[PDB]
Amino acid sequence: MTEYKLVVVGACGVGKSALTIQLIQNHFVDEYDPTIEDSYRKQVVIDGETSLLDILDTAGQEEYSAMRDQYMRTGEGFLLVFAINNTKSFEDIHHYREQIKRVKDSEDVPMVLVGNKSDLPSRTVDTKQAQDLARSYGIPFIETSAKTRQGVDDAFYTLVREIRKHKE
Ligand SMILES: *CCC(=O)N1CC2(CC(n3nc(C4CCCCC4)c(-c4c(C)ccc5[nH]ncc45)c3C)C2)C1
Ligand SMILES: Nc1nc2c(ncn2[C@@H]2O[C@H](COP(=O)(O)OP(=O)(O)O)[C@@H](O)[C@H]2O)c(=O)[nH]1
Ligand SMILES: [Mg+2]
Ligand SMILES: [Mg+2]
């Protein structure tokens, strides 16, 4: 068995907590306290290998902190989450990624770009725009809906596969 320390990053209101809770416990949270930052664990079987996902759902303040750098440095892989109906959250991805590259002191950190809220028709971020951004970073792009659970397992398992390719 292998342990994977994952970190979920993205602006307030993109669905980091909803995605994390859908993954760990299979239910959709309509509202979840934006101040609650916690780690959640779930044992899953990925590609026949038993894996333990230790997932840090970031929250709190959008400020620089050396203590936050310590928690980020423990992450092996990062889910970069934006909402497909919130262009600012998509534009913020570049800035969260820059902070992670700084803390990890590497240009090759395992990451997956996640376009959440795919069930909504009020889309403002084109699939082509998000695919182009993910290609520019050399990382996978996955569209998810924490509401219907579509793409949720794929998002986290894809990040685990990225960590495996990086370790090898
Ligand atoms: C509504 C609460 C919520 O859900 N939040 C997610 C969160 C934004 C997130 N966050 N912001 C930053 C920095 C982005 C650039 C300006 C300073 C804040 C980070 C971050 C990262 C990704 C890496 C290292 C680091 N060190 N200090 C801050 C960071 C994060 C995780 C928190 C508010
Ligand atoms: N329709 C829809 N709403 C979502 C989805 N994910 C989150 N939400 C809603 O968006 C809001 C913010 O979600 P939350 O998990 O609190 O975002 P966080 O601030 O990134 O942790 C909540 O009202 C959620 O119910 C989704 O995939 N589809
Ligand atoms: Mg913002
Ligand atoms: Mg949250």
From Swiss-Prot:
A Pfam family that this protein carries is Ras
Q: What is the effect of changing residue 14 to I?
A: In NS3; affects activity and impairs responsiveness to GTPase activating proteins; characterized by a strong increase of both intrinsic and guanine nucleotide exchanged factor-catalyzed nucleotide exchange leading to an increased level of the activated state
Relate the outcome reported for changing residue 22 to E: In CFC2; exhibits an increase in intrinsic and guanine nucleotide exchange factor catalyzed nucleotide exchange in combination with an impaired GTPase-activating protein-stimulated GTP hydrolysis but functional in interaction with effectors
The entry's stated outcome for residue 146 to T is:
In OES; somatic mutation; also found in colorectal cancer samples
| Extent of motif Effector region | 32-40
Post-translational modification N6-acetyllysine, affected residues: 104
> What is the topology of this protein in the membrane according to its UniProt annotation?
Lipid-anchor
Q: Which SMART domains match?
A: RAB, RAN, RAS, RHO
Q: Which InterPro entries match?
A: P-loop_NTPase (IPR027417), Small_GTP-bd (IPR005225), Small_GTPase (IPR001806), Small_GTPase_Ras-type (IPR020849)
Q: Which SUPFAM superfamilies match?
A: P-loop containing nucleoside triphosphate hydrolases
According to the record, mutating residue 13 to D results in: In GASC, JMML and OES; also found in a breast carcinoma cell line; somatic mutation
Report which residue ranges the record marks as coiled coil: none
Disease cited in the entry: Leukemia, acute myelogenous: A subtype of acute leukemia, a cancer of the white blood cells. AML is a malignant disease of bone marrow characterized by maturational arrest of hematopoietic precursors at an early stage of development. Clonal expansion of myeloid blasts occurs in bone marrow, blood, and other tissue. Myelogenous leukemias develop from changes in cells that normally produce neutrophils, basophils, eosinophils and monocytes. Leukemia, juvenile myelomonocytic: An aggressive pediatric myelodysplastic syndrome/myeloproliferative disorder characterized by malignant transformation in the hematopoietic stem cell compartment with proliferation of differentiated progeny. Patients have splenomegaly, enlarged lymph nodes, rashes, and hemorrhages.
Role played: Ras proteins bind GDP/GTP and possess intrinsic GTPase activity. Plays an important role in the regulation of cell proliferation. Plays a role in promoting oncogenic events by inducing transcriptional silencing of tumor suppressor genes (TSGs) in colorectal cancer (CRC) cells in a ZNF304-dependent manner.
Cite the record's note on assembly.
Answer: Interacts with PHLPP. Interacts (active GTP-bound form preferentially) with RGS14. Interacts (when farnesylated) with PDE6D; this promotes dissociation from the cell membrane. Interacts with SOS1. Interacts (when farnesylated) with GPR31. Interacts with RAP1GDS1. Interacts (active GTP-bound form) with both SHOC2 and PP1c (all isoforms) to form a tertiary complex; SHOC2 and PP1c preferably bind M-Ras/MRAS, but they also bind K-Ras/KRAS, N-Ras/NRAS and H-Ras/HRAS. Interacts (GTP-bound form) with MAPKAP1/SIN1; inhibiting K-Ras/KRAS activity.
Q: Under which name does UniProt file this protein?
A: GTPase KRas
Q: Which gene encodes it?
A: KRAS
